[PDB]
Design a protein around this ligand. Sequence first.
Ligand SMILES: Nc1nc2c(ncn2[C@@H]2O[C@H](COP(=O)(O)OP(=O)(O)OP(=O)(O)O)[C@@H](O)[C@H]2O)c(=O)[nH]1
Ligand SMILES: Nc1nc2c(ncn2[C@@H]2O[C@H](COP(=O)(O)OP(=O)(O)OP(=O)(O)O)[C@@H](O)[C@H]2O)c(=O)[nH]1
Ligand SMILES: Nc1nc2c(ncn2[C@@H]2O[C@H](COP(=O)(O)OP(=O)(O)O)[C@@H](O)[C@H]2O)c(=O)[nH]1
Ligand SMILES: [Mg+2]
Ligand SMILES: [Mg+2]
Lengths: 432, 439, 412, 429
Amino acid sequence: MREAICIHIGQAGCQVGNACWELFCLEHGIQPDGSMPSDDAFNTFFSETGAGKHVPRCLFLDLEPTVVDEVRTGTYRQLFNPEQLVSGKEDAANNYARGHYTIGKEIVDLALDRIRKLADNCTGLQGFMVFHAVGGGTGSGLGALLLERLSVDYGKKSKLGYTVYPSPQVSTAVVEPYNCVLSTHSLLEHTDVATMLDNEAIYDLTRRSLDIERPSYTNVNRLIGQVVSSLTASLRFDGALNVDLTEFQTNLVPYPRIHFVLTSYAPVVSAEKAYHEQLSVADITNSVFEPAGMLTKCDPRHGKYMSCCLMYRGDVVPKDVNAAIATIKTKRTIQFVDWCPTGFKCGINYQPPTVVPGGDLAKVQRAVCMIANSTAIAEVFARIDHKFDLMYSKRAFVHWYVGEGMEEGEFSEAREDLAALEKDYEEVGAES
Amino acid sequence: MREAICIHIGQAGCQVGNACWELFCLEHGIQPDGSMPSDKCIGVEDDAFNTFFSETGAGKHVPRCLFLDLEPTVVDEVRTGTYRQLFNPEQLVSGKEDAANNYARGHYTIGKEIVDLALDRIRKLADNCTGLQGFMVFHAVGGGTGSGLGALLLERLSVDYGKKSKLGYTVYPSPQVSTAVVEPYNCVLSTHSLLEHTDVATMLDNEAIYDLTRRSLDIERPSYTNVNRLIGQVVSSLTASLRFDGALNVDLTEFQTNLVPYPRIHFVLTSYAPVVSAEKAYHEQLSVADITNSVFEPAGMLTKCDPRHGKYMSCCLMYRGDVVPKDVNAAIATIKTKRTIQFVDWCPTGFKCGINYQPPTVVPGGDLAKVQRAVCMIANSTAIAEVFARIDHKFDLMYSKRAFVHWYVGEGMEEGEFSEAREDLAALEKDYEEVGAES
Amino acid sequence: MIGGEYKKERFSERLTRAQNQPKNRGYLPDTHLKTGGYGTGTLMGNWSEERSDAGYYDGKAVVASTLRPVWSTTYREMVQNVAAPVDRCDRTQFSQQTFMVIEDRTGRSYPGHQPHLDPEWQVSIQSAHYSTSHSSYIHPDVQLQEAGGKSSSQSTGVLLRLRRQLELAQESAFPGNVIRSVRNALAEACTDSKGNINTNELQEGFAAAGVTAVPAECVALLRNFDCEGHLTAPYVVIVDALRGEMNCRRADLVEGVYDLLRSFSTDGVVRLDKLVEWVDVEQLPAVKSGDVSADAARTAFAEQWDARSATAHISKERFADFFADVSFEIPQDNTFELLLRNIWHLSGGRGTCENTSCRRVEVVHTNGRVTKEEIKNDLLIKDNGDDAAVESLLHANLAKQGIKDVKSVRVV
Amino acid sequence: REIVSCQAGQCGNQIGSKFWEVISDEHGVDPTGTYQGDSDLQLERINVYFDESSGGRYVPRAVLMDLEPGTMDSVRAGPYGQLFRPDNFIFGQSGAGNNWAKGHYTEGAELIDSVLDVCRKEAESCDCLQGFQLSHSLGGGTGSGMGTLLISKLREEYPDRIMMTFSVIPSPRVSDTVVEPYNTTLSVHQLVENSDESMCIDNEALYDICFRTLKLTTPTFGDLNHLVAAVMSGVTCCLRFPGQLNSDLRKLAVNLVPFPRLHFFMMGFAPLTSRGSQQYRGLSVAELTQQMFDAKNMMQAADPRHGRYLTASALFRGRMSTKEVDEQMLNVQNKNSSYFIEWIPNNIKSSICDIPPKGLKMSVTFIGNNTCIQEMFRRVGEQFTGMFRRKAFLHWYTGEGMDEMEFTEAESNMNDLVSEYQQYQDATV
Ligand SMILES: Nc1nc2c(ncn2[C@@H]2O[C@H](COP(=O)(O)OP(=O)(O)OP(=O)(O)O)[C@@H](O)[C@H]2O)c(=O)[nH]1
Ligand SMILES: Nc1nc2c(ncn2[C@@H]2O[C@H](COP(=O)(O)OP(=O)(O)OP(=O)(O)O)[C@@H](O)[C@H]2O)c(=O)[nH]1
Ligand SMILES: Nc1nc2c(ncn2[C@@H]2O[C@H](COP(=O)(O)OP(=O)(O)O)[C@@H](O)[C@H]2O)c(=O)[nH]1
Ligand SMILES: [Mg+2]
Ligand SMILES: [Mg+2]
């Protein structure tokens, strides 16, 4: 029961999965072989076999084989299924057209077959969680294709896209705004909740809260996996206020088109500083709501919050979270929209957040992750469309798309989708 | 952090830098290969060497010092010497031809073809430092290159780094015995540049140190090696307050602001105690008061300028070893009661004392005796007017009927520069007298 | 390197009539590497960069006659003090294999590369053997397993590391065996009469005691603690530094215990036989739990007292050090105070550290008043088998304390 | 993902021989073709550049083209000569005379049938051909003529595959032929139309690097080819080795080609330290990035400061963190906004590969699309037109079969490319 199927698309998704699956294995006591040396809670992320092994409900997809072969030769080779770990032969080259038109259909059928096998195995499938990067080709192309096929094949199943976006100034691609603006078309219609996972905010969090001189994708993906585990632990473990996928779906999405959400996590402290500060529920809530303690480069003080969901883990108390809510509401720096008087969905889980050894998080008795739908998120679109327009004025880097089966107009539908995506956020944020 | 960049200019600067860098390597346990032994690193990753040495990815330590001499002999022989592995092929710049006791040649013809790359090397030395405290220019105003190229480099450093701390240990011509005949010309010409672009100028004339090592260190016939080792010991005593912790620590700016009362008054006499060999030391009780009295006496000074006919303005004391603040206070009280030396009326305190827990280390094969404690006294005093009057009277005799001026005017210098420098030094005499005058 | 064989013309070049081009090796006449138009000896232009090459042979013989040995200069005679004497970047230790590889200029990433002169080549190759994700995602068990400016700072860091390693090793009928065995191992490793130990003796002393010490570790220890300047220091100061300075509270307790023992001494002098007769070893945690017997506890007590005679004299320093070992290996001040007070019947302490060894007595006075009193300092008042004698001793102690109106005493 | 390489002319053959030496050093392959690599990563993706035989010998997917048999004689006499197959060597009888007409119309054309046969044999042997590699010199006759003919043909027989061509541009300072402008002009218009990416190497810049960047007393053509081989392997390291930011030929082409006619790139390699300063210059990402954008480090003779960067690609190799390499690109974009185009945000594509060059801690190859590329074409423009004014050496080309029209067509296409670079050099938003 309460099974959720994890899907990873592109290199970014593959690394995010390779960083969250060892966290899940540590949480549920699963060795890389897939056994417990020395209670049904792993069923959400692991499928039981009569031999005692626990195969994850994970799909790995990438048009290029380097990352999947690294996974196949890694420590978790005996854990991961040889199938559902699929590979292509030529990458998308950050070409949404290549990933969605030419190379997409030759692997999408296999991907849907493996997802069908996973869903058949899952007898209580709660939904799908897809990890990809909109800035890439496979993340945008194969991401859009898989989103469309899953939406047309599985009805109204909950779908959570924990997706990485082009950061405001630290980005590693030039056609990346093109890929983002093109993937938005799928991420509006076929995605139930999308979670912003840019890289600059993670970098700043690591450099200003962990004092790590040289952190990298290993650290950022460990933090992403920690956020995902914090969000999903509500159903895998008991708690005072458990939540379900559809439950916070309803609590978070006010309108069908308003589903892009900021994310934040606390207390993210080092081992040296773990045993010094007073890491109470109120303190961690304040750290959560601080602009610098989140996972996306989007300052909420320029916008207005619409719905905040607070997943507390450990020995947290409902009155502690109530006091945190009261202090937050009294605090005027953050603004709540006028038509949402409550605006808070808090859940409590009794399982403390496990820390993977050798990482940056330190073993802390309690933590909290916030998923916030807010009007401030219009800024990421307002800058990504500006970046897209600076190249689309005379459309550089578009012959690559055109030669891969892309019509010239698809960019125009991308631009109109961005326009409407900013406009409905402005409308909902406008005072009555 | 707390890095300090050494810049050695001229032949005298090169030898003084060789001596002080040998001393620094011995103090920090750095072999000529440039790598500290496993003993000196296994305890903790001490940051003591950081100010003078920068670590590399292989654990090797490279000095933060730019050698810069126009003629190639001294820098070339340093490259050929044992410290080849210790120094970089860069950062050790050698020119093509010397100025030859010609400030005009070193500042207008040969200086410019090397100053650009000198500043580029200084940039590559400074961007490495994250907490650079300042620069320390080691040179002699007597030499043509050390005067001219030193002045040009100081000007460029000032205009590029703004108000950064800038010490200069400079060897002025001795009042009585000197080598060059154009040395007074070079000194007078470079004095203007020192005034304009030097935060503190430390006096390092030759004959005073020679007499000091003749009478105190008992070396009857010391060569340049011994005087350079003494200068290096003085520099190490001055700069150890930040490398090693102490009861009262000072940095590049504290003694700067405590010894510079006025922007133009920044020329400081130096003295070191106890400069004792292995023989006169074991008979004497080297106490804090004893070494303080010795370093305040004119016999123990490193510059041929007795303070009895001068007027003290501010003395900075650097104590090294097992020195106690209460012993320092007793020494200060004894000095204040003593009437043979008198402080200026408007500066009652006049003392800036700082203690460090690192006793001075004697170089193997040297002549200084390894002592428990030592003191280095840097005095800003009006007595420097005496040596400056000596040098500008010498310059006036030189310039009475235009001697050795064709060499300078043939290297691209106007004749009025000599008059400008002479009037600048005359105004310096005037302001020394003014600050020494009782209110 | 000596000789310069790798610069000499090889057999392949003779057998194929090979020449200076394209492999500029310089073995043939008129093929030397002229930089500036002059040899590597006439150092002009690119000379320093040329000499920095790994396959560079200086050309100076290693044996010189002593009949014209006067050509040194001032810098040479100043730096001869630090110059190394002459017999993985040692060109002298390099073999002809690596030298001819360097001459052939193979296995280089870019022209002018010096893999052999690079000292981190081995670790670079080992790192290149692994990927970032593979090294990041090592199996959790072995991954969890892999987790100032003073002259004495490095040595005090050494002492801290050794102390924490001894604490981890700890985590013995009577306490003190850790420092006891460390001192015994150092004493055994000694070969000098007055207690002076060199680096190798110190290293193998730690090895016998159960401490992993690097030769550099030992050399740092001896260089800090040396006073005669022979890279040799007494072992007592090293052991005391490893044990650490005594805490104020525990030192005060030890002083009180010694004062009590001195007062209880028959002749006013603390003696080993009275010490071991007065110690109540029955109240150790191990003895209470039944791990060890009282006889074994007393035997160990004497054994790490290390007294050369059964009637030896115990003084200030001896008592302080003996219980300082116990203080070092017991981490909690409260439990150390409780254990010491329990062993030596010192009345006092507050709360958890309050002494429980002394016999509480219900005393009825001449007026019938019943009071629950605590006897103080009852080391010699033991079960001698005579109830009348014990009762009289209790009355004498109470009278000395100040309660003189007693009429009956019962031990609670 | 297989890349098959072909080397035209003496220059191309020697550069490719050095490239295969570098590749075999990276992959642990002897001249005998056997394997000694101590790491599984050296053998996991050996199929990109090598094919295993029945005996297991790893033979490179390489084709060799030069009219003179002496080039193949030297190639075999090289230390890694036997690594190649015998049937990939296709050589004519007489030399090209350094005539583009001879190498492209009469002798090279009659020779290229077997070249196409063996190239398509290698293509069919490849499971999924990633791309075609060319190493050639445009100043020569056989390197330029046969190279242009082969890339032209391979464009039709393989339209969707990558065309990565390393062209050695002649320049007046290292000019050693009078028909260099003729050959360069007659080759540039095939390169512009039959190459997905055509990056340039100039002997002036190579000698400058060997003189003042490496300070080497006397390197040779071997060491120039060694630098070119290092960058040659660095441009495709991401295919054969894992990394945090995987990349390949199309990955680089998409990010570096804004418009189809703009596919000529600079070339650079870091670190490049003199052997006297190797032990002293600490290797770090910041130092690498500082060396990347320096004009002297660029193997392109044209000064990049004059031009404005269309795009750039930074293929880093070794274990390093990600923001310590991305924030460097941020700095070079922010503090040098004048040298980068405004209407292109984030001009630098960056990728990271896990395995550094053998024994190095880290390295990086820099491939930059800049408006300074047009300087070579302009200078060869006046060099070509001055000769073409009065029939200078033109009679050889005319009598070999070429006509008067094609020379002006070539110079007109080159002028069109130069104008394309101009109109973006001073472009405004
Ligand atoms: N959080 C995280 N982001 C990554 C990681 N690796 C790459 N990214 C980001 O993801 C973006 C593109 O991801 P992908 O969808 O895999 O695109 P790609 O890496 O080019 O792979 P292809 O689409 O197949 O070409 C890049 O611009 C990176 O900024 C990672 O390991 N962790
Ligand atoms: N203390 C000290 N002073 C020196 C030393 N060498 C030279 N001098 C002084 O420097 C003065 C002349 O300058 P030099 O150092 O000899 O030469 P230079 O400064 O490099 O100038 P050039 O002659 O042009 O090269 C002499 O009068 C000496 O007093 C030295 O090794 N130690
Ligand atoms: N970098 C490099 N350049 C070379 C090499 N051999 C020749 N060249 C260049 O190629 C130019 C002449 O090319 P050419 O020999 O006519 O080419 P070919 O006709 O194909 O053999 C000269 O200007 C050289 O600079 C080499 O091994 N390396
Ligand atoms: Mg990819
Ligand atoms: Mg000189």
